[PDB]
Design a protein around this nucleic acid. Sequence first.
RNA 1: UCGACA
DNA 2: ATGTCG
Length: 136
Amino acid sequence: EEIIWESLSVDVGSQGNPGIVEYKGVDTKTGEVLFEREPIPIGTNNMGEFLAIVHGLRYLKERNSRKPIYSDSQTAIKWVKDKKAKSTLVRNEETALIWKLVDEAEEWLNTHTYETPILKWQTDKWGEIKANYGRK
RNA sequence: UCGACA
DNA sequence: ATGTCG
Ligand SMILES: [Ca+2]
Ligand SMILES: [Ca+2]
Ligand SMILES: [Ca+2]
Ligand SMILES: [Ca+2]
């Protein structure tokens, strides 16, 4: 379809997978960075993509914005839709932080409401999502 | 056996 | 390579 420029685009950035994970949200039109998560020692790409969308949901809700959120992650979009992050990253002391954030994100989703449309960013047609990290 | 999204 | 879904 056509790009809805009046929106929020989110993405994960990592060093290894599993590895160090962070994420950010930007204004789709300008690329202005609206939020960024402090790096988490160990996590997966999908967990990060998931946390980015949920944070985007909370970010927009707090500001009473009805703008949609763009994510290029089929997995993260589904996890948010199901309000359940089906990650199989092992749960141990080293992954405790990322899992805490994931569990808290799920917790938020199951105790709050929103109608924010979560749209699939069509990378194969529009290029890389505006919140992207690293080379293509 | 892949196909796809990262 | 690894994380996930269809
Ligand atoms: Ca992405
Ligand atoms: Ca988070
Ligand atoms: Ca949803
Ligand atoms: Ca990237």
